[model samples]
Target: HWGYGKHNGPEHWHKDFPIAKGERQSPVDIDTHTAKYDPSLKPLSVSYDQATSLRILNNGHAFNVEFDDSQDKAVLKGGPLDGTYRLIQFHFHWGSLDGQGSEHTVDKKKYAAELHLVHWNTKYGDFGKAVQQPDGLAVLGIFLKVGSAKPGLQKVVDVLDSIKTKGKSADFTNFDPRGLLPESLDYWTYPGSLTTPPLLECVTWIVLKEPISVSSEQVLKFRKLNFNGEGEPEELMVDNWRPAQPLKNRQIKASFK
Candidate 1:
């Protein structure tokens, strides 16, 4: 399996997954000066149902908060999308050190943490099929800054202790992920790939310009997670972020000024 360890990290992923070195790779550095702001992009419309929030699982990669997408209980419209996208799950990527860990960067600066709300296009049926085609997923990315403690985030962190090891899972319902987002929905949009392998280039990224605040204590808790399952050697999950890639010629569109 692919991991963030030195042997199977992003650097050597191209050996097994050729698309790792593909043209439309993700986690590209966003240069505000170079990024053209487009006014044509529509305001993001997110309709999330807290009741649909289900269990949280540690799949040896990240802690995923899976949702019940059997109906249109939670969906994303507007922004740079064609139709409504169903919320499948949400997870995060962080670093082992101070002031690092986010996959996407802006102006050569990295954030303390980054959250990914994974969604699949309803037109493609399910997540498994959507991830294979181009326009299959819409991943909303929110950067987290180190400042005041976030009460909403506490609920998420409190469950981490129970899921410290891989394959561990816990019930995490009634949590509104909308609380984790920033007040202003201004964002940048572009075509990118899944930060992790199979590293599919089916994601239409929507990264919020404003970042939310979380305490330093909360940021370090992510490192406490292990990538290995029970009865295996301990391996702390740190710096679980893909390095920024070349932007190539793709342009970024802004929803606001």
Candidate 2:
């Protein structure tokens, strides 16, 4: 029911989904000077089993690397979370151009792209029912910059061609998710929404301060994806990110001082 075009774009989302304008919306511009430094915030602990990686798909909205979340084979704990959050999938949001696609920006400077590792609270039993409550989801946001080619990301890019069309999917397994993370675990934390509809306001965002590198040519491949099905006219997949929302009374806290 939503898209990133002129007719179904972010601005028009609220007309169909009222929660789009709800408090604590996502992709807010983070101001370093104003972010509170919290010493109590524990270091983020991530544990992912490559065996749990099921497959990758192009669902028209974006390319998603899905995992088997039936158990705690892959999970995230600590870093503002009270219980375990199971890894369900990981996706990206990029632009047609470089340095202009990331959902969250720093001091108004945009990046090449943004990665989201979606997780859900296991205490709630299931993702579908959990998404309706506060603290039901926790997303790890990794900024992507244009520079050296990331060997870890090559596995994902390699399958882009196979899933270029909407609803397309390919077998993708035994991929270690820990290899995709940056060295520094320092991050900024906030309460936000899904960024896409149903725009649920249940995510606890953990945006990393460090960015991973990706070659310019490698990023271009993502643009080859089509939003529509095979029978329709060709359209490039780019700029699938939601714009920053109002901060309201939310307090963005940093893990490092």
Candidate 3:
């Protein structure tokens, strides 16, 4: 039943290992000065109305959600290139389903969590079709960690118990994904393959320099889910990211402004 971007884990996802497809992938690691990079000076503007597409789905790997990127509203406009791109989707990568390895990793250190803001070049088409073309995507990576002793991630943590059961999701209404965004927009960008299966490598990755702090309890709450199946034993899934792959002669850049 699991096709390409379906239920299969990262390794099992790509078979023929379609390369040249999908300009970008998830799990962005932060960088400083990227070569072919563009920096954003303006704040991200998004309306909650369209953000309704931002619904929480219990995808088993984690209580992931796809952003309401209907129009180019979610964005890829401004700052660097006037390249028109659309926000195809956005999801979280985590480990233990509980909260171990976040999708975006740095060296061997897995922070609290990682946020991926995915976008595709409008020159191609919609996400479904554009996912197969080169020069068609962009992803922003933000890191998360436990801070102070307060529960800052209350927005997401509130739903932990509800979505803990595999394939079980409640109406996660009125929550803003941007609200969960890290305060500093500083980022690192690069060209890399998708962390999941298929390893599609046509992406411009932007990783944020600053990290947002959540509470340790919030991190603990994220560790109560499974891989979304009856047989799978409930284990802690927090560090949900891939380890740092070889830079491989690839240039990683960042906005040191």
**Better model by lDDT, 2 or 3?**
2
Pick the lDDT winner.
Answer: 2
Whole-model lDDT for model 1 versus the true structure?
Answer: 0.89
- In angstroms, give how far residue 2 of model 1 lies from its true place: 1.2
In order of TM-score, best first, we have 2, 1, 3
Top-TM-score candidate index: 2
Clashes of each: 0, 0, 34
**What digit string (tens of lDDT, one per residue) describes model 3 on residues 1-257?**
33223244444443455542333444444343344454543433333334544556666655665665566565755422247666655666654432455655554456667767677777776776655765566666667776753343576677667677567766665565567666666555566766765566656666666766766676667766655455577644444455555465555554555
Assess candidate 1 and give its TM-score to the true structure.
Answer: 0.97
Cα displacement (angstroms), candidate 2, residue 124, comes to 0.6
Instruction: State in Å the error of residue 186, model 1.
Output: 0.3
Ranked by lDDT, top first: 2, 1, 3
For TM-score, candidate 1 versus 3, the one ahead is 1
lDDT of each: 0.89, 0.92, 0.58
How far out, in Å, is residue 251 in model 3? 0.8
Q: What is the lDDT of residue 78 in candidate 3?
A: 44
Q: Which ten residues in a row have the lowest lDDT in candidate 2?
A: 45-54
